[PDB]
Design an enzyme around this catalytic site. Structure first.
Site, short mmCIF file in Angstrom:
data_model
loop_
_atom_site.label_atom_id
_atom_site.label_comp_id
_atom_site.label_asym_id
_atom_site.label_seq_id
_atom_site.Cartn_x
_atom_site.Cartn_y
_atom_site.Cartn_z
N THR A 1 6.15 -4.49 1.71
CA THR A 1 5.15 -3.82 2.55
C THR A 1 3.87 -4.63 2.73
O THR A 1 3.69 -5.69 2.13
CB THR A 1 4.75 -2.44 1.97
OG1 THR A 1 4.00 -2.61 0.75
CG2 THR A 1 5.98 -1.58 1.58
N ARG B 1 9.75 -1.23 -6.12
CA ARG B 1 10.51 -0.07 -6.56
C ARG B 1 11.47 0.48 -5.51
O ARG B 1 12.63 0.75 -5.81
CB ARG B 1 9.60 1.06 -7.05
CG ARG B 1 8.81 0.78 -8.33
CD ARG B 1 7.59 1.69 -8.47
NE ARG B 1 6.82 1.72 -7.23
CZ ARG B 1 6.20 2.79 -6.73
NH1 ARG B 1 6.23 3.96 -7.37
NH2 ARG B 1 5.53 2.70 -5.59
N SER C 1 -6.90 12.25 -14.78
CA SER C 1 -6.30 12.41 -16.11
C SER C 1 -6.12 11.04 -16.79
O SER C 1 -6.14 10.00 -16.13
CB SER C 1 -4.95 13.10 -15.99
OG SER C 1 -4.04 12.28 -15.30
N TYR D 1 -13.87 -5.63 -5.35
CA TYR D 1 -14.51 -4.79 -6.36
C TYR D 1 -14.10 -5.12 -7.81
O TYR D 1 -14.73 -4.64 -8.75
CB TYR D 1 -14.41 -3.28 -6.05
CG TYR D 1 -13.01 -2.70 -5.95
CD1 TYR D 1 -12.25 -2.47 -7.09
CD2 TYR D 1 -12.46 -2.36 -4.72
CE1 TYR D 1 -10.98 -1.91 -7.01
CE2 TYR D 1 -11.18 -1.82 -4.63
CZ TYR D 1 -10.45 -1.60 -5.78
OH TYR D 1 -9.19 -1.04 -5.71
N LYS E 1 -7.79 -4.76 -12.12
CA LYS E 1 -7.88 -5.93 -11.25
C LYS E 1 -8.81 -7.01 -11.80
O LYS E 1 -8.54 -8.20 -11.60
CB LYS E 1 -8.33 -5.55 -9.84
CG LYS E 1 -7.33 -4.74 -9.06
CD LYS E 1 -6.21 -5.59 -8.54
CE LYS E 1 -5.52 -4.91 -7.38
NZ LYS E 1 -4.47 -5.80 -6.86
N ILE F 1 -8.15 -4.97 5.02
CA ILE F 1 -7.23 -5.58 5.96
C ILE F 1 -6.51 -4.48 6.75
O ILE F 1 -6.12 -3.46 6.19
CB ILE F 1 -6.27 -6.53 5.20
CG1 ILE F 1 -7.08 -7.72 4.64
CG2 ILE F 1 -5.13 -7.02 6.11
CD1 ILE F 1 -6.43 -8.48 3.50
N1 LIG Z 1 -4.80 -3.63 2.54
C1 LIG Z 1 -6.08 -3.71 2.18
O1 LIG Z 1 -7.12 -3.40 3.07
C2 LIG Z 1 -6.43 -4.15 0.78
C3 LIG Z 1 -7.75 -4.04 0.33
C4 LIG Z 1 -8.07 -4.42 -0.97
C5 LIG Z 1 -7.05 -4.90 -1.80
N2 LIG Z 1 -5.76 -5.01 -1.36
C6 LIG Z 1 -4.72 -5.53 -2.28
O2 LIG Z 1 -3.64 -6.10 -1.58
C7 LIG Z 1 -2.41 -5.89 -2.27
C8 LIG Z 1 -1.31 -5.37 -1.34
O3 LIG Z 1 -1.41 -3.99 -1.07
P1 LIG Z 1 -1.16 -3.39 0.41
O4 LIG Z 1 -2.48 -3.20 1.05
O5 LIG Z 1 -0.11 -4.23 1.06
O6 LIG Z 1 -0.55 -1.90 0.25
P2 LIG Z 1 -0.21 -1.21 -1.17
O7 LIG Z 1 0.23 0.27 -1.00
O8 LIG Z 1 -1.33 -1.38 -2.14
O9 LIG Z 1 1.05 -2.09 -1.63
C9 LIG Z 1 1.59 -1.82 -2.89
C10 LIG Z 1 2.85 -2.64 -3.02
O10 LIG Z 1 3.14 -2.74 -4.40
C11 LIG Z 1 4.41 -2.23 -4.69
N3 LIG Z 1 4.36 -1.48 -5.95
C12 LIG Z 1 3.59 -0.39 -6.26
N4 LIG Z 1 3.85 -0.03 -7.53
C13 LIG Z 1 4.79 -0.85 -8.03
C14 LIG Z 1 5.42 -0.93 -9.27
N5 LIG Z 1 5.08 -0.14 -10.27
N6 LIG Z 1 6.34 -1.92 -9.49
C15 LIG Z 1 6.65 -2.83 -8.51
N7 LIG Z 1 6.02 -2.75 -7.29
C16 LIG Z 1 5.11 -1.77 -7.05
C17 LIG Z 1 4.80 -1.36 -3.50
O11 LIG Z 1 6.18 -1.41 -3.26
P3 LIG Z 1 7.09 -0.17 -3.70
O12 LIG Z 1 6.39 1.07 -3.23
O13 LIG Z 1 8.49 -0.33 -3.06
O14 LIG Z 1 7.27 -0.18 -5.24
C18 LIG Z 1 4.02 -1.95 -2.34
O15 LIG Z 1 4.77 -2.92 -1.64
C19 LIG Z 1 -2.71 -4.96 -3.43
O16 LIG Z 1 -2.66 -5.68 -4.64
C20 LIG Z 1 -4.11 -4.44 -3.15
O17 LIG Z 1 -4.83 -4.23 -4.35
C21 LIG Z 1 -5.45 -4.64 -0.08
#
Ligand SMILES: NC(=O)c1ccc[n+]([C@@H]2O[C@H](COP(=O)([O-])OP(=O)(O)OC[C@H]3O[C@@H](n4cnc5c(N)ncnc54)[C@H](OP(=O)(O)O)[C@@H]3O)[C@@H](O)[C@H]2O)c1
Ligand SMILES: NC(=O)c1ccc[n+]([C@@H]2O[C@H](COP(=O)([O-])OP(=O)(O)OC[C@H]3O[C@@H](n4cnc5c(N)ncnc54)[C@H](OP(=O)(O)O)[C@@H]3O)[C@@H](O)[C@H]2O)c1
Ligand SMILES: NC(=O)c1ccc[n+]([C@@H]2O[C@H](COP(=O)([O-])OP(=O)(O)OC[C@H]3O[C@@H](n4cnc5c(N)ncnc54)[C@H](OP(=O)(O)O)[C@@H]3O)[C@@H](O)[C@H]2O)c1
Ligand SMILES: NC(=O)c1ccc[n+]([C@@H]2O[C@H](COP(=O)([O-])OP(=O)(O)OC[C@H]3O[C@@H](n4cnc5c(N)ncnc54)[C@H](OP(=O)(O)O)[C@@H]3O)[C@@H](O)[C@H]2O)c1
Lengths: 280, 284, 282, 288
Positions: free
Chosen positions: B34, B56, B122, B164, B179, B208
């Site tokens: 994703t 997952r 929690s 952050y 983080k 993003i």
């Molecule tokens: N998009 C933004 O504006 C933004 C802003 C600040 C930081 N970030 C950072 O960018 C990164 C990407 O996030 P995103 O924005 O693409 O959407 P997201 O919803 O944060 O993506 C989470 C991803 O991690 C996987 N994931 C969650 N729990 C997991 C687990 N326990 N084991 C293995 N995989 C797990 C999910 O896949 P599954 O659900 O299939 O497990 C999903 O592909 C993150 O680290 C986030 O902190 C993004």
């Protein structure tokens, strides 16, 4: 294999141009200290990729010769303008000439520096002020003037200041340089904030030792950096691919900073068998 | 004010590295199915990397892995993995080594997050976040690093944190905490594991693009006048993981359009003051 | 009770001397900018605690008045020396006089500063240089010279620089000030390292706003800081109680920095009811 | 010599600095309060008239320490057994603190664990253990107390003890480095989020304090990396701690204070290894 061998294999320098050939075509770059070392390599790369470069420092002789050497190596014109950055008037003139022989800059690189390695108690007030004048005020003067001009013309540009890893941490024996470089970083962050509405973005590279001793023992990557590797990073940051990179500070140091700053990194020499005994 | 940000901060959403520059390289990306993980995987594959994605939801993983694989003509393997389980992690590393080989590129990108007042969380909600982000990246890093050490091989590691992580922030406290821990780990292993041919870097992204009035007010805090794009982030990541960056180690790169510098600067709220207003004050 | 009252109750200033009566006796303190505001406050408390203070700034008028006003309050003598810190000659003479009338300083507080609030576009190169000079170079000249003297005399001192919270972050509209203040911080860190062998330690305070309503909304402590509060922290850091504190950077800001710097802290005005709603959508 | 210059000028003042009975009527809750740094901080806060409550796994050490201090100060020190990585124990411990002493005005998260080891030799459980104690423990303690303080409309000063390697990271102590950094981020986050509730949050980052080294030589080598020329003392640290938790510091919030003799600045500065260079050696390089 051994440390040194894994370091050589897996941290081998890729010294060739990275960005697309002619990617900087129709872009004008301005490099203080563009005539030697880091400034030169960055010019050589921007030129070699299609930018119209203007370089500026004190020594016309080396400046003309470097411009000539690059111009004939790339085919693209490198213009030399004599400038002491700590002089506002020479700066205004240099900006004025930059805008005539090329046009408004799309890339501003602040790379001109001075430095003294010395016990601080052996520095005179003038020796201090000099370093401050070149690094801090010189970068301010260049940024102020170019900034003022880009606003008037409603153009934007990518600014890049080259500092050093001790800018963040401080360091004995390089005190006015550490202070002025810290000033330079704060300025970048300050203007990244202030001048976004004007289409100006501001980034920083903090290099470790670039080959241009056994400081190598304090570098996880097991070698000194190269000019071409650095220029590649500079080009990336000043490229349109990096249009959303703003207010950032990038260490280019082979890991030197994190290594020396870590309290327990002085254990990196400890042998496997000593480790077996220590866990006992 | 915005047409300057329109033209001079315009996104370059095509591939920046040279075609097939990642031939012969294997990339492993958590959260690879994703958002940002997908965008990163998309780019690396189109540059010729043999990509392996892990998270997952296996159904999303396969869909994505198939979609990129057909668009690039290079194979994207999918592996189901909860990063907070060491046993599942072990398996995943093992399966990656069998189906693709030891990775040259490891990208911890899997995260979870609550936006909530801290008093409403929690213990388990807190622990969940710490588990996915901190321990999850650690487990992935631990095992992969153990195999690379055994095989006498090296790799570039990349962790996606957040702006952050460095400052902290109310309302995302467990995420901020975990983080920050991730950043510390990267810097720690940049230092410890340099000797094994492993380097560690970190990107800190701002918002993003992944009533619409919340987006508008967010942009008000971004000097660059827009959210980032996945493609732009993907290029930074590829760069960081490429051989061009083989001397880049322990670095922490903000990819935020200038958001952190804006909100953190004490007098930056003075950006609202008008040109005519400044004339009144400059007289005082 | 509400926020404002919780903030009032649990963050109430304690505006009295903190350290033991006469704990700074036999100590000499040098304070730049010690005639007004924060420097005055720090001078008062050090004087009230038994230190022989020497204050230095441009305006002899306000300096002598202050130095008299405090000496009549505490009993202990506060000397004034006219000095522009951006002038290395005057700095050299000032240090020389400091040592002649009081002795070698045990405490050195670099507090003199200048600032403009302005769009950076409207700054002349000269306006920039002026801030740089007073702040960065001035602090360096005072530190350089005293340091040289303290090394000669084989004596040590606690040094303290007052910077600001934006020294670390940068900030628009105060740009030469941020750059110079940042330079002052790197200097302290550099010298703490370099000059430990000579018995000199270097610390830094970053104050937020010290005694408008817009801010207090950005201060989690819900009020501005006071001069007596800042003075106590300064005194502590310059005391023998802090003899192992060196190269430290202490925010004294009621939390302003952590508040503004946190991406999601703009949600602070979100209501319990809206919070109920926001969770229902996730 | 240099050691006589450092001994004279960075000399430790190991005695109470805050005014006698300045903590009277204040309750303090200290995790790890039975040993090392926690003990010193407990001792001092009690000596200044605080009702102290200490907490940790080992009831025996806890009881002994609590009694020892209560007799020294005539002020009550209560022990409560607690594993901070256990949310339900934490709940019961906080509930017990409120009943036996009252809501805390002072909360010191000091409990920790550490391994010094090559990362490659850590099992996931070794890693997770440290994260649980340091990060999740401090969080559970803070979460629960904070919930209670908000309910009661009381505030408090929070203090977390980390380390200089929390900001920098460091090989060989990686789980600790990670968990400690998370703790710092938490303090900063909650200084912003919970000021409205009357809560402030600060951090001390200690370097090496006096209490692996059979000969004494490793401590000798450590001193060489310390500008101040000695290790710190518990009493010194305890004074910094008491200051940060006193009303004198009611405006200090979200701060992070190095207490390290200047070690972090010395090791982290690129050219600081040039301190070895002699005067004559400099008299040649400058003659070039
Ligand atoms: N998009 C933004 O504006 C933004 C802003 C600040 C930081 N970030 C950072 O960018 C990164 C990407 O996030 P995103 O924005 O693409 O959407 P997201 O919803 O944060 O993506 C989470 C991803 O991690 C996987 N994931 C969650 N729990 C997991 C687990 N326990 N084991 C293995 N995989 C797990 C999910 O896949 P599954 O659900 O299939 O497990 C999903 O592909 C993150 O680290 C986030 O902190 C993004
Ligand atoms: N090389 C490294 O390993 C290293 C390490 C850390 C940081 N850096 C940084 O990298 C940058 C480039 O350094 P370098 O190693 O290439 O060589 P350098 O020793 O910094 O050379 C200084 C350059 O700046 C110019 N310059 C000096 N004073 C000037 C002035 N008053 N006005 C205008 N220009 C002036 C010089 O040209 P003129 O003599 O003609 O005036 C020269 O080209 C510097 O900012 C430095 O701080 C380098
Ligand atoms: N007050 C706050 O809310 C606040 C907030 C953030 C940071 N700070 C910092 O706190 C410190 C104290 O400032 P303040 O608020 O009391 O007033 P200030 O206006 O910032 O400091 C000015 C003081 O410095 C002296 N000074 C100015 N130029 C000088 C020069 N060239 N040479 C020698 N002395 C000079 C002035 O005396 P003369 O006029 O006689 O020269 C005056 O006593 C400053 O370092 C400031 O940066 C204060
Ligand atoms: N001393 C130094 O030179 C130094 C240097 C840097 C940082 N620090 C920091 O300073 C703090 C105090 O350290 P220290 O040296 O006095 O001792 P320490 O070994 O760091 O901490 C041990 C203390 O924590 C308690 N503890 C351990 N696990 C616990 C758990 N699961 N639940 C609740 N309590 C637990 C222990 O009590 P029980 O055994 O009864 O459970 C013991 O009192 C620590 O946070 C440490 O990281 C100290």
């Amino acid at each position: 294999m051994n440390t040194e061998a894994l370091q050589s294999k897996f941290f081998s320098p890729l010294q060739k141009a990275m960005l697309p050939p002619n990617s900087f075509q129709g872009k004008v770059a301005f490099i203080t200290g563009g005539g030697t070392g880091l400034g030169k390599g960055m010019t050589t790369l921007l030129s070699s990729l299609g930018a119209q470069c203007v370089i500026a420092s004190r020594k016309m002789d080396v400046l003309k010769a470097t411009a000539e050497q690059i111009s004939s190596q790339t085919g693209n014109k490198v213009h030399a303008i004599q400038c002491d950055v700590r002089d506002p008037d020479m700066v205004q003139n240099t900006v004025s000439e930059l805008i005539k022989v090329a046009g408004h800059p799309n890339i501003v690189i602040n790379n001109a520096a001075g430095n003294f390695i010395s016990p601080t108690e052996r520095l005179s007030p003038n020796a201090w002020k000099t370093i401050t004048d070149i690094v801090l005020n010189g970068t301010a003067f260049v940024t102020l003037e170019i900034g003022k001009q880009l606003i008037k013309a409603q153009k934007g540009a990518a600014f890049l200041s080259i500092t050093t890893i001790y800018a963040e941490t401080g360091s004995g024996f390089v005190v006015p340089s550490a202070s002025a470089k810290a000033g330079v970083e704060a300025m970048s962050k300050s203007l990244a904030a202030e001048w976004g509405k004007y289409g100006m973005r501001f980034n920083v590279i903090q290099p470790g030792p670039i080959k241009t001793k056994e400081m190598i023992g304090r570098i996880p990557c097991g070698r000194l950096g190269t000019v071409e590797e650095l220029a590649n990073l500079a080009a990336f940051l000043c490229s349109d691919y990096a249009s959303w990179i703003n207010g950032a500070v990038i260490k280019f140091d082979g890991g030197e900073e994190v290594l020396i700053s870590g309290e327990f990194n002085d254990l990196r020499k400890v042998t496997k068998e000593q480790w077996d005994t220590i866990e006992e």
